[PDB]
Design an enzyme around this catalytic site. Structure first.
Site, PDB file in Angstrom:
ATOM      1  N   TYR A 132     -55.006  -4.869 -19.362  1.00 10.98           N
ATOM      2  CA  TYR A 132     -54.349  -6.090 -18.915  1.00 10.98           C
ATOM      3  C   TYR A 132     -53.181  -5.689 -18.005  1.00 10.98           C
ATOM      4  CZ  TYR A 132     -51.875 -10.581 -19.241  1.00 10.98           C
ATOM      5  OH  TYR A 132     -51.227 -11.755 -18.948  1.00 10.98           O
ATOM      6  N   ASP A 175     -50.380   1.807 -15.274  1.00 10.41           N
ATOM      7  CA  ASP A 175     -49.609   0.657 -15.700  1.00 10.41           C
ATOM      8  C   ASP A 175     -48.935   1.118 -16.985  1.00 10.41           C
ATOM      9  OD1 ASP A 175     -48.558  -1.565 -16.862  1.00 10.41           O
ATOM     10  OD2 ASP A 175     -50.256  -2.880 -16.378  1.00 10.41           O
ATOM     11  N   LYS A 177     -40.815  -3.883 -20.282  1.00 15.79           N
ATOM     12  CA  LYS A 177     -40.414  -3.902 -21.676  1.00 15.79           C
ATOM     13  C   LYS A 177     -39.156  -3.090 -21.975  1.00 15.79           C
ATOM     14  CE  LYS A 177     -44.065  -6.358 -22.696  1.00 15.79           C
ATOM     15  NZ  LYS A 177     -44.809  -6.358 -21.406  1.00 15.79           N
TER      16      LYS A 177
HETATM   17  C1  LIG Z   1     -50.058  -2.830 -19.802  1.00 13.69           C
HETATM   18  C2  LIG Z   1     -49.482  -4.213 -19.434  1.00 13.69           C
HETATM   19  N1  LIG Z   1     -49.342  -4.630 -18.006  1.00 13.69           N
HETATM   20  C3  LIG Z   1     -48.832  -5.872 -17.666  1.00 13.69           C
HETATM   21  C4  LIG Z   1     -48.442  -6.747 -18.654  1.00 13.69           C
HETATM   22  C5  LIG Z   1     -47.908  -8.146 -18.259  1.00 13.69           C
HETATM   23  O1  LIG Z   1     -46.648  -8.339 -18.823  1.00 13.69           O
HETATM   24  P1  LIG Z   1     -45.802  -9.643 -18.745  1.00 13.69           P
HETATM   25  O2  LIG Z   1     -46.168 -10.647 -19.712  1.00 13.69           O
HETATM   26  O3  LIG Z   1     -44.468  -9.085 -18.885  1.00 13.69           O
HETATM   27  O4  LIG Z   1     -46.134 -10.210 -17.326  1.00 13.69           O
HETATM   28  C6  LIG Z   1     -48.564  -6.360 -20.047  1.00 13.69           C
HETATM   29  C7  LIG Z   1     -48.139  -7.304 -21.169  1.00 13.69           C
HETATM   30  N2  LIG Z   1     -49.263  -7.607 -21.905  1.00 13.69           N
HETATM   31  C8  LIG Z   1     -49.084  -5.103 -20.413  1.00 13.69           C
HETATM   32  O5  LIG Z   1     -49.189  -4.782 -21.750  1.00 13.69           O
END
Ligand SMILES: Cc1ncc(COP(=O)(O)O)c(CN)c1O
Ligand SMILES: Cc1ncc(COP(=O)(O)O)c(CN)c1O
Ligand SMILES: NC[C@@H](N)CCC(=O)O
EC number: 5.4.3.8
Lengths: 427, 420
Positions: A144, A239, A267
């Site tokens: 994701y 990512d 995060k």
């Molecule tokens: C690996 C990864 N990349 C992108 C995101 C998107 O994060 P956000 O909700 O902060 O847009 C997430 C959060 N699930 C993630 O875990």
């Protein structure tokens, strides 16, 4: 165990917000649909609006690696908000975090802060295509990268190249350039390149998966993706929004020794505040405006509060024995859950790296999303609920990795295992 | 006027971040390229890293409507963080803000909080298409709705690299304040227009007010073609009026995006409208949109407190009062000093272009003398006044701006323009 107040607040929320939440998973639809409304969190715990106290293994999805409401982070924040919550102009704190981020993660020589993982990934995606002049992107099923249209594509055998939108409201036009492949499948990626010579801008992936449950790359996978992208002048993008500063101070790229061209962060680098960042090699990042032609803006990006919390959090992570501890307690937790699943007669597989772990109710092993999808969701649902009843707050989904923090104590892990034993014995 | 520390930090920043900034405009590229690095902001002021103070008219681009670092907002924040900076789960504070937003704006019955105007806009765009089952979107030239690809359209061709033409093909653009153009677009694309999105009042290509009947006309044709009307009030929401432009001008859109003010300085965003449409949003509906840290308790806290403050009597009258005097003063000084200029203001939002205008659209805005604006901007900076580092950015005032501040700002303008 009762959640009357949460039930009430959540019920009222349904009339105010879609599904009564700010994010889909919060609705607990994967595990009973009875979400917990939080009142406060501290160290390794969270408190219900009903007074229920849990040992938390979500840590607000990554940020709370040093524990919830760490006094030093809040203290730094008290000072920062005194000077204004936002400037909309350069501030010295941006330079500081930037430097820390650069010195910390291998591939990052320059970074652009944003306000979420979604923003980071959509920008990094645009930069890959801008730097290479190619439109096609390769993502892995189970990974994701936010909700930008490009990523909202159906995946799985049979539609890997179909670019079919997996959500209404997104034109096939936009997903038409997103190619997917099974995680841990090098030949699958080589295939995508060969089928699209001169069109693959690059490969993006969670160097260690957390969005399809916890999935570690098979030996040689990250190396292979690195070789294949270099061979086609394509970009490799990690990512590390979730893994960044959690798997290691330098992320998975540092721990596993594979350096991508661009990586996304988030995060942890925000200490709880909405944040995100996308950085990488100097020559690529120079394309990002106002240094280059690739447009990307963020009015409240580089927010002083977010920078302050991020900086303080990294300083804490810099302390001795930091990651050794996370690894110790987490391995203990992970081995415990698997040993307990075994002794209670439940098919299960999982693992952990530093303060990140996974536990699937399936024999596995789990090398990709297809394997993960074999987990007994009903069993997981009952498991999650039971653990909740035992005072353990786990991610409300079988396909979400768990998180530990420097605040979790040896005792927290054991109380958790005791609870897991109690719950699995009743599953 | 010394900016030594700013230059030093900025120079070093250019090696750490693209352009040495987190957002393009901050680089001052359109006004000399020597941005001032802020150390802190208070009330109506910004304080340099060099010890210079400025009467601030950027207000961190909108959020600081009650003033920078308002004591009640910072206090509410300090108290709330003690319970955690983030939950990654539901908290009562989301219900409260959602409810205050629903009560505040005419078109919102249900809201989804996000983390920026960009997320709000890309999400609203997706809901527009999901609700109507159509892909084509109509946006106006000069309007800004975040950096989402569909918006990065030339004027459906990409305006910047890294964005496949295929994604901008479904984005139709037209001149702002041009009903006929919009009508023509609907005709040239029968049954394909999901809707129209725009800043009910433009702030991203300078301050541009809609012409009489423009917004009304857009609501009419969208209704005629069973298409949605979307107001991007990320900048205008809670600023032009408690209920935004839609309240003030009395035109109700089907969906509207919000941001800035609703987060009191913290990263924030939101999109909402009729519940019938909003119910399509996951997990209530099939339209996907998520945000791990959305509904941040600190952001909700600051937004809730910021709105409470705005709800006090005389808030918008005050903003309108000082801002009209500021805007009228600028135009008067421009006139007496012999400089072609045009501008205006609505509440604490204003614009000042170095062009006789008229300015009804971006094309008009581009006739401004950017060289003159740059020198004006620098001179104002030297006079202790901080204006948006672009001719194509509206200006903002706050409840903290005193009558004295305005007097000083006009005096500064006189000095600067008399020197232009
Ligand atoms: C690996 C990864 N990349 C992108 C995101 C998107 O994060 P956000 O909700 O902060 O847009 C997430 C959060 N699930 C993630 O875990
Ligand atoms: C009307 C409007 N819509 C969307 C945005 C994007 O905002 P952000 O940087 O918060 O994504 C802005 C900020 N320029 C805006 O003014
Ligand atoms: N790792 C197996 C893939 N070919 C995808 C299977 C699926 O989810 O359909």
């Amino acid at each position: 165990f009762k959640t009357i107040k949460s039930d009430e607040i959540f019920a009222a929320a349904q009339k105010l917000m879609p599904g009564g939440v700010s994010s889909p998973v919060r609705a607990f639809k994967s595990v009973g649909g009875q979400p917990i409304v939080f009142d406060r969190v501290k160290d390794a715990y969270a408190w219900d609006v009903d007074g229920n106290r849990y040992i938390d293994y979500v840590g607000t999805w990554g940020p709370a690696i040093c524990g919830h409401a760490h006094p030093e982070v809040i203290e730094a924040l008290k000072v920062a908000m005194e000077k204004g919550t936002s400037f909309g102009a350069p501030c010295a704190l941006e330079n500081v975090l930037a430097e820390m981020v650069n010195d910390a993660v291998p591939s990052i020589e320059m970074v652009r802060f944003v306000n979420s993982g979604t923003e980071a990934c959509m920008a990094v995606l645009r930069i890959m295509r801008a730097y290479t002049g190619r439109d096609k992107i390769i993502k892995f099923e189970g990974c994701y990268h936010g909700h930008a249209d490009m990523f909202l594509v159906k995946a799985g055998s049979g539609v890997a190249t179909l670019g079919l939108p997996s959500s209404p409201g997104v034109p096939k036009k936009t997903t038409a350039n997103t190619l997917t492949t099974p995680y841990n499948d090098l030949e699958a990626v080589k295939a995508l390149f060969a089928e699209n010579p001169g069109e693959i801008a690059g490969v993006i992936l969670e160097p260690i998966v957390g969005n399809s449950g916890f999935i570690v790359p098979d030996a040689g996978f990250l190396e292979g993706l690195r070789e294949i992208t270099l061979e086609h002048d394509a970009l490799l993008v990690f990512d590390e929004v979730m893994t960044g500063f959690r798997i290691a101070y330098g992320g998975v790229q540092e721990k596993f020794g594979v350096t991508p061209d661009l990586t996304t962060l988030g995060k942890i680098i925000g200490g709880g505040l909405p944040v995100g960042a996308y950085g990488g090699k100097r020559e690529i990042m120079q394309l990002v405006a106002p240094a280059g032609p690739m447009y990307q803006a963020g009015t409240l990006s580089g927010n002083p509060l977010a920078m302050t919390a991020g900086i303080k959090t990294l300083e804490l992570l810099r302390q001795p024995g930091t990651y050794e501890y996370l690894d110790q307690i987490t391995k203990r937790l992970s081995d415990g859950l698997l040993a307990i699943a075994q002794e209670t007669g439940h098919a299960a597989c999982g693992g952990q790296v530093s303060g990140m772990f996974g536990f699937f109710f399936t024999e596995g092993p789990v090398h990709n999303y297809e394997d993960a999808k074999k987990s007994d969701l009903q069993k997981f649902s009952r498991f999650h609920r039971g653990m909740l009843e035992q005072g353990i707050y786990l991610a409300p989904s079988q396909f979400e990795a768990g998180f530990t923090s420097l605040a979790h104590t040896e005792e927290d892990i054991d109380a958790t295992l005791a609870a897991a034993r109690t719950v699995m014995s009743a599953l």
